[PDB]
Design a protein around this nucleic acid. Sequence first.
RNA 1: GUUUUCGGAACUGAGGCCAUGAUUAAGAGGGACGGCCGGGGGCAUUCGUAUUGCGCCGCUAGAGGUGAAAUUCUUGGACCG
Length: 135
Amino acid sequence: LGPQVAEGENVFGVCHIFASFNDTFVHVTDLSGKETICRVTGGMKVKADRDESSPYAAMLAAQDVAQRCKELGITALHIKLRATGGNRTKTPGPGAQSALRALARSGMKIGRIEDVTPIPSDSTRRKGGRRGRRL
RNA sequence: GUUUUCGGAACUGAGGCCAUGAUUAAGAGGGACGGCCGGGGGCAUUCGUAUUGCGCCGCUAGAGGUGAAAUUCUUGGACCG
């Protein structure tokens, strides 16, 4: 079970670390993007809606996802870090570098680093009011 | 009784003469013309990513939002690629 190749060559999957402030996602996928493997979020580790985006919650989100693909023989990953973008914040969540460091310390290797977050040319109306979030 | 002259008006045709007759071109304005310039205006056409909805595939029980939660969507398979 796995790619029938010599271990000196490094196979490639792509992970899409969708970092936000509600939670952080780690969604490893093959190089096509079509047939995905496993989606170990940051919220699956701790049972607290406050701690759903903590930098430790992505330390454990990218430790279990480095065991399902190591079970299938994947040794080097492609990283597409993505903040929520669109009309919301285009600055990455705090649980992003921690999910990278847990992927780079669990024996796995990296490929390319690339920032695909949805930025518009220009978009529709923002969620709040004209006077904004009065808080 | 007639007829002139002059007087005084009113109107036309030649000629001479006028040093014959137009103040300049506003560090005022209008209008030409010349090469440019500008997210000026209108009509037609064209491109972009995003958002939302829909079709199919993948892997799966969480996802949304908050100072914290909760109203809300999920194998009448959500979020994610």
